[PDB]
Amino acid sequence: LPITRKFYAFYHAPIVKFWFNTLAYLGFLMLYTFVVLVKMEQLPSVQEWIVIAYIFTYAIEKVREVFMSEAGKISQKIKVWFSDYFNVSDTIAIISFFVGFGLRFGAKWNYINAYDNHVFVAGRLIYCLNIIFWYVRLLDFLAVNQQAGPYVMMIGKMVANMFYIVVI
Amino acid sequence: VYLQVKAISNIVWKYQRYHFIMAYHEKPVLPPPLIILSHIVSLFCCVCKGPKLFLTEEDQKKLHDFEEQCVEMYFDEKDDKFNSGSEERIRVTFERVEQMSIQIKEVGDRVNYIKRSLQSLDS
Amino acid sequence: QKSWIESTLTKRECVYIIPSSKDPHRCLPGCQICQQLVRCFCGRLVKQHACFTASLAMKYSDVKLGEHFNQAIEEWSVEKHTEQSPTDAYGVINFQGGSHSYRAKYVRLSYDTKPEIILQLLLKEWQMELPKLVISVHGGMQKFELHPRIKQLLGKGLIKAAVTTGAWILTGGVNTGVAKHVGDALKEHASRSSRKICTIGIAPWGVIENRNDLVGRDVVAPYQTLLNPLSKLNVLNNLHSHFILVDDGTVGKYGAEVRLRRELEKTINQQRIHARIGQGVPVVALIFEGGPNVILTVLEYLQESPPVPVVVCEGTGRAADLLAYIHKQTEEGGNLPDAAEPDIISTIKKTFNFGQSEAVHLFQTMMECMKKKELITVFHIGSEDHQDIDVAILTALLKGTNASAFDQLILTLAWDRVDIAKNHVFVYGQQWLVGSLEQAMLDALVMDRVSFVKLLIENGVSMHKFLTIPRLEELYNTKQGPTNPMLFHLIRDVKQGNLPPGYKITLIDIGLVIEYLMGGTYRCTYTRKRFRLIYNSLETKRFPYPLNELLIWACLMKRQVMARFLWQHGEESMAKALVACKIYRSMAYEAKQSDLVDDTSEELKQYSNDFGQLAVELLEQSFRQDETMAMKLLTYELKNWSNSTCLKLAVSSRLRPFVAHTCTQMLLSDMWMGRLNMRKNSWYKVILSILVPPAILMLEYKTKAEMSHIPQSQDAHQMTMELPITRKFYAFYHAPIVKFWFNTLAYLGFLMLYTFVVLVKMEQLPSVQEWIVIAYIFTYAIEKVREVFMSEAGKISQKIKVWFSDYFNVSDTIAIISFFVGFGLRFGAKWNYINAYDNHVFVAGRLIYCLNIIFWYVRLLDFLAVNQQAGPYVMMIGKMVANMFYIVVIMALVLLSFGVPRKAILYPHEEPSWSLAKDIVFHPYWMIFGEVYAYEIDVCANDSTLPTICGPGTWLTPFLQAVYLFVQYIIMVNLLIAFFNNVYLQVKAISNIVWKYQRYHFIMAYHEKPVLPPPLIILSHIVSLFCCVCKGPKLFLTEEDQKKLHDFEEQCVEMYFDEKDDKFNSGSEERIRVTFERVEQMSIQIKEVGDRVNYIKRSLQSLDS
């Protein structure tokens, strides 16, 4: 096994792509947690820019996966991908984020004290609610473990089954 | 409901592991901030131009034979599991005791008519 | 050519074109028909020759102008006038038939191929296992059918004989005779022997339906199996697996097999049946339902040098029923009865239409056959003769061939047929040489022939005399049996990491492997002085207990069925089972730590647990007979197994069912007591007596007899000879139960003081209470160092590694280290400020104390774990923490998913700070524990306690909190309840076993712990140390008690096997099947009597008139 072949073997292994995406995702959440918890100025901070870059490119990556799936028919490719819980949530997460960035970034500051401008506030509050989607997607990463993964599947099944007791 | 839900959830977890692992064979190397290079580059290189199992012909031979051998074992172990159960041995025993119970009596009649011999033969 | 066949084996195409016999058929002009009808004496019409050389002979007129001096028309020879050229067909035919293709093979070799090339063709080119037998069936062709009795049986034996012996069945192959009956017998026993019987049809390339469909270089020709009507031609019988078609001559002529097939019958015999064995491969012949050239062939095989014996199954047809009676009218090897010309040659004239023109010629062939009837076995059907011919075929090779019984035995050994040898070789009056049965034992062990080892031990081989050093050396070094590749991997890891070229293994190296596997201080007999000296010098060269040495052999060679057998022989059965468990367990470990391919770590871990269960089951058997003698079995020194005990061996293998067995637990409880009868006493009189020493003199102690089953110290067993006053104090303070409460009271008094110290204000100098606390922990710490550096295993790095495997020793280590950091800061701190807590070094010291004390309250769970009820629950708590981990990880994520939005919405004007980390986790955690923070939920309400937080978006946080608590309480808390409810019983069960198991190490520890507890323990350290400069528990048994105990062990092992045979033979499943089989047998005899009684009816007719 020559030297350069060994790098190929490493970076193209699925286990490596996972931790390589998992570390990037954790670093993504640390920054996006920093952004929502720290005061927000007119222009996005370096942390907020990196967050936007992730979600934009993460979104293109999902469009790649849909339009290259298996079955030729788009209306079948679409219909299967929106059968997974976390792809529905990711779709809501991506769409809601850019509504938020649009309001946050497109808002004109007539008032010097932020939070006088409601369009800005609606943007920031979308961020603070959009981040819930991204912490819950960590359950998808955690679902790679043989012990954890079934319990994640159980939680959704038990919510469905307990519905009528909760209605009462 | 814990045990039945846990059991169904293990099967579903194990099943959805196919689609998850297969996905990471077509995902780019680079992660989603730096993934754009793997998008731009890969796209551009395509304009400049799934996983398969590869088997030698001898390996195809030995694999097709392996499949045939194991199907044969599968039917043999069923016939020998059914023919060796107690329920099947009771009924073949039942039917064979039914048959004998005729022949036992039938011999019983013949031997009772070889008694007719004893009378005629001795005088 | 890319093929050995294409470059070696040949065709025989008739280049020379002899016109047919002489005469044209019809059709007056003789130029069209002299070409067209007139075939070759080759045997085909003229244009089929296609002679690459003489293709233009037919266009002219033909090869070889007509007249040619009639003599020279027979001058055509298969030898001369036939161009040897490539094969042109060798491949894989199939047979669309009884639910399988039933594939096969053909080479289509010429005819005059050398005899060796077949053997090379059969073994490497076709990849066939060399057989242990060759059945060469013969007979006539195109017969209808047999009696439905005989038909079913002939197969049943023919199959059985061939499958049990890896035999080849040589047939003609063509489905018009002998082959038919072979094949029809195969399908009645197919998919049971379809991979052990390699039948071979050595048929010609003449008489066959589609010769041209068989053609094709390396083809998969889909050959038919439909009887092509309107013809006489024959088909290859489908149920054969190999064919050697013989290209010669033509269609119709079928005589070119005797030259080749016979040579194969001669060349297989010159092969050696096995490596360890020197006898040649046998050849047998089963003639059923034969003809005139068979009777020639029978005598041609008997007259041969050496003779090939013959079987004759009477009633199949003419030659069988004939010979069966024609070699019945004779002396044993001599002359015929009163002149037999009339009746013998009568049937020879009736069966074969002769009329004395060929009726003497057969009778002359008969009278030569009867010169050797000892080789003509005959299967007397009707009178259950030799039971389903397999005996009759195989015993024919063991009937008279002046072969010694040593050769009759090896042949059964290679066949793996014990029933044959015991019933036909170990017959009354049989006589043996001195080491013939020894050489047969060496072979059976090297070949893993377990059932022949039994036959030879019974019949009188003695392992005490058989087994020697050089023999036992060989048994390790043989590559002539089911070896273990991993043994070398363990040898080269103990030698130096290297190996010489071949390296014939030595027994000192085996001794070194066992010590590595058995571990600890195990020292093997093979690494001892006397063995190391005598082996250098290589009764002295025997072994006193040879089946201990072969059990080790069989277990290191991964020969389990031989190990189980050898285990049942000899003495010390429970110990041997526990040694085997440890050997396999350690082998399984190093297999799990080697990059080899066949991991064999579940095969070895399963073999370990098989012997593990045997030891447990023998203990239960012994315990059911006599508890007190069974407890002695756990602790008597073995002296053939490094002076260990059965209990220590089980602990070595981490064998919990043995240690957690109630017998072992009963013994541990008795050792806990010491000399104290804690049935007549109460725990509060012990505590009272630790505080009131003179109350020691009014407890109920135990007699030396009541202590007979209990191991003791040497000093403790000498004070058993009598109970004076001072001996009674010894018995009290050295009992483990007393040392416990004596340390437990001191520990509780230690915590009361250390609780006092942390709760009461702290001055510059430590108080009297704090000094006593420091003294305890210092001396408690030395006590732990004593325990580590005096444990068991010599190697510090193993002593260290085991001690830090216990939860509470890790915590004690952290506790001791953290304490003296705290005392150092507390005591070493200089007070620059008069008000304490201005000096931070002092504070850090005191706060370490206040946190270090948590370790010491939790160590009380270790004391509490001495109770049978409490102790399992303590073990459960740790197991449930491990198992609940991922449910709690999910809860932690739900917490953050709420905490981060809450803080962000409510506190939007924050700068970076570590308080942010607190605030996202703090309130969400306390919500889990019944605190909803009711007046902070809606911060804009009138009753809000956070009115200044009221601002834009804050109306979202009640919705978030409502979702959060639904998920945590309604889902996640109750999932955890459901988790614990459903795993409780299996965790409680595992925790009871672990509690019971760790009770060994706990009770054993208190036999080596000092009497005095950890503040006053220093005296027992200083004194004991100093007294050593001035200079384990064993069971002691008298010689008579050793006798009665060794007999007890033997008795209970015998009961153990008897109760198994009688439990299996008395189950309903076993009685149904023996009933099944006996009803199957009767159902034949009932009908058989039914036929006889129906033929005693034939009497009634004839007798009465």
Ligand SMILES: CCCCCCCC/C=C/CCCCCCCC(=O)O[C@@H](COC(=O)CCCCCCCCCCCCCCC)COP(=O)([O-])OCC[N+](C)(C)C
């Ligand atoms: C398969 C599933 C995954 C993929 C799904 C992907 C597509 C999903 C959908 C995505 C679109 C979501 C909506 C976008 C925003 C519109 C709403 C809005 O309020 O806009 C505002 C910003 O208007 C602007 O023009 C500034 C924003 C710049 C563009 C950023 C958003 C688009 C990027 C898309 C990136 C994703 C693309 C991914 C790759 C192609 C307008 O309001 P305003 O003018 O600020 O306020 C006026 C009042 N004032 C007086 C106070 C100023």
Ligand SMILES: CCCCCCCC/C=C/CCCCCCCC(=O)O[C@@H](COC(=O)CCCCCCCCCCCCCCC)COP(=O)([O-])OCC[N+](C)(C)C
């Ligand atoms: C198998 C497991 C169990 C066994 C494990 C056993 C070994 C485990 C390890 C044990 C060692 C743990 C660390 C010791 C303390 C060092 C740290 C420290 O801060 O020290 C301080 C005290 O420095 C002194 O010199 C005064 C302390 C006297 C010695 C007491 C500790 C050693 C005893 C060991 C007894 C155990 C031995 C057991 C028997 C051999 C230094 O700080 P300061 O000078 O005070 O402050 C300076 C600032 N000022 C200006 C404010 C003044």
Ligand SMILES: CCCCCCCC/C=C/CCCCCCCC(=O)O[C@@H](COC(=O)CCCCCCCCCCCCCCC)COP(=O)([O-])OCC[N+](C)(C)C
């Ligand atoms: C069964 C019983 C329930 C019946 C339901 C009927 C729903 C009817 C809907 C009514 C909404 C209108 C009521 C408020 C009037 C508007 C202005 C106002 O006062 O806003 C108030 C907040 O509230 C909001 O700003 C918006 C609240 C929207 C969510 C309401 C629940 C929607 C349904 C369920 C959603 C879940 C998902 C549903 C689907 C599954 C202002 O309050 P404040 O915080 O004190 O702010 C003032 C102080 N400040 C200026 C400093 C900020």
Ligand SMILES: CCCCCCCC/C=C/CCCCCCCC(=O)O[C@@H](COC(=O)CCCCCCCCCCCCCCC)COP(=O)([O-])OCC[N+](C)(C)C
């Ligand atoms: C998927 C299931 C859906 C469940 C149903 C839908 C959800 C429930 C729907 C509720 C109706 C919506 C209420 C609108 C009220 C507006 C009034 C206002 O001024 O602002 C209020 C809204 O702002 C808040 O922050 C309070 C929102 C209510 C949270 C309810 C959580 C409990 C969930 C229950 C779930 C169980 C449901 C039971 C079954 C139906 C806050 O008032 P304030 O800050 O004090 O403002 C000052 C006013 N003052 C001056 C008078 C003090």
Ligand SMILES: CCCCCCCC/C=C\CCCCCCCC(=O)O[C@@H](COC(=O)CCCCCCCCCCCCCCC)COP(=O)([O-])OCC[N+](C)(C)C
């Ligand atoms: C997409 C994938 C990303 C992957 C990560 C790698 C790339 C990104 C890495 C680093 C980018 C850092 C940019 C710094 C910009 C300089 C100025 C600055 O912010 O100074 C700050 C110093 O910095 C901090 O306080 C750190 C803030 C980021 C926290 C998360 C980093 C760790 C995770 C990622 C790394 C470990 C990975 C962990 C996972 C294993 C000081 O605070 P402030 O912000 O100036 O204050 C703003 C106040 N205001 C707004 C009110 C005015």
Ligand SMILES: CCCCCCCC/C=C\CCCCCCCC(=O)O[C@@H](COC(=O)CCCCCCCCCCCCCCC)COP(=O)([O-])OCC[N+](C)(C)C
């Ligand atoms: C510069 C930075 C330097 C540091 C970088 C590195 C830092 C560390 C990085 C990452 C943290 C994890 C490290 C531990 C991994 C253990 C190994 C393992 O077995 O993993 C498993 C986990 O597989 C997963 O997919 C786990 C997903 C992790 C992310 C989820 C976090 C949840 C947080 C929510 C809670 C809130 C907590 C928030 C705390 C604030 C994979 O193995 P398996 O598939 O299960 O194997 C089973 C099959 N077998 C039996 C055949 C083997």
Ligand SMILES: CCCCCCCC/C=C\CCCCCCCC(=O)O[C@@H](COC(=O)CCCCCCCCCCCCCCC)COP(=O)([O-])OCC[N+](C)(C)C
């Ligand atoms: C800020 C607040 C805190 C943050 C929230 C914490 C994070 C969120 C927590 C947990 C999320 C768990 C992730 C889902 C796991 C996978 C499930 C899945 O694959 O499908 C499941 C569907 O799923 C459902 O029916 C619902 C899934 C749970 C939704 C819970 C939402 C939270 C609020 C709810 C309460 C609101 C009411 C209270 C309001 C007063 C499958 O279920 P099934 O149909 O039986 O099985 C078929 C599966 N199959 C198709 C694959 C074969």
Ligand SMILES: CCCCCCCC/C=C\CCCCCCCC(=O)O[C@@H](COC(=O)CCCCCCCCCCCCCCC)COP(=O)([O-])OCC[N+](C)(C)C
């Ligand atoms: C290592 C093994 C140890 C074993 C124990 C035996 C040896 C140890 C036994 C006794 C030592 C007592 C020393 C007394 C010193 C005189 C001064 C004094 O302290 O007066 C106190 C009176 O005394 C108390 O208040 C008792 C304090 C100790 C409580 C624990 C004793 C019971 C446990 C053990 C015995 C039962 C065993 C229980 C288990 C079955 C008054 O208070 P002060 O303390 O003066 O106030 C300090 C205030 N200042 C600091 C702010 C200035």
Ligand SMILES: CCCCCCCC/C=C\CCCCCCCC(=O)O[C@@H](COC(=O)CCCCCCCCCCCCCCC)COP(=O)([O-])OCC[N+](C)(C)C
């Ligand atoms: C394995 C061994 C590891 C530990 C080794 C030993 C470590 C030794 C550690 C430290 C020695 C420190 C010596 C002094 C250093 C200079 C500072 C000084 O003297 O004074 C300063 C001390 O201020 C502090 O904050 C001191 C904190 C140090 C204690 C840390 C304990 C760590 C042990 C963790 C547990 C480990 C457990 C390990 C086992 C698991 C200030 O004091 P002052 O003059 O009063 O100032 C007044 C200021 N004022 C105006 C605000 C009022």
Ligand SMILES: CCCCCCCC/C=C\CCCCCCCC(=O)O[C@@H](COC(=O)CCCCCCCCCCCCCCC)COP(=O)([O-])OCC[N+](C)(C)C
């Ligand atoms: C001067 C002083 C005078 C007084 C001195 C004397 C005072 C009293 C001294 C001590 C208190 C205990 C006395 C009761 C003993 C009962 C007898 C018994 O059976 O014990 C068992 C307990 O075995 C142990 O190992 C128990 C450990 C006790 C310490 C744990 C305390 C937990 C405190 C934490 C909670 C906080 C409470 C804190 C309270 C503030 C041993 O028996 P066994 O092994 O289970 O037998 C089973 C096998 N069999 C069936 C064959 C039999």
Ligand SMILES: CCCCCCCC/C=C\CCCCCCCC(=O)O[C@@H](COC(=O)CCCCCCCCCCCCCCC)COP(=O)([O-])OCC[N+](C)(C)C
């Ligand atoms: C001041 C505070 C209060 C005081 C605390 C109260 C006292 C502390 C309480 C209980 C301690 C119980 C003692 C251990 C019992 C024995 C267990 C054992 O032997 O091994 C167990 C291992 O153990 C573990 O994996 C962890 C053990 C429990 C640690 C709990 C720490 C407390 C905090 C945690 C929560 C923090 C998170 C929350 C933070 C927000 C065995 O488990 P296993 O691997 O399945 O089995 C193999 C066993 N075998 C090897 C022998 C075969």
Ligand SMILES: CCCCCCCC/C=C\CCCCCCCC(=O)O[C@@H](COC(=O)CCCCCCCCCCCCCCC)COP(=O)([O-])OCC[N+](C)(C)C
């Ligand atoms: C997805 C649906 C689309 C969204 C619309 C429909 C949603 C329902 C209803 C409508 C939305 C709420 C409208 C009413 C409030 C407006 C008035 C207002 O100013 O309120 C507040 C700000 O509020 C905001 O700035 C709005 C933020 C909206 C975030 C998105 C809601 C979540 C939808 C998820 C739905 C999922 C349901 C659950 C899942 C089944 C108060 O501001 P203020 O105090 O007046 O400002 C003065 C500040 N100053 C004093 C500093 C100057």
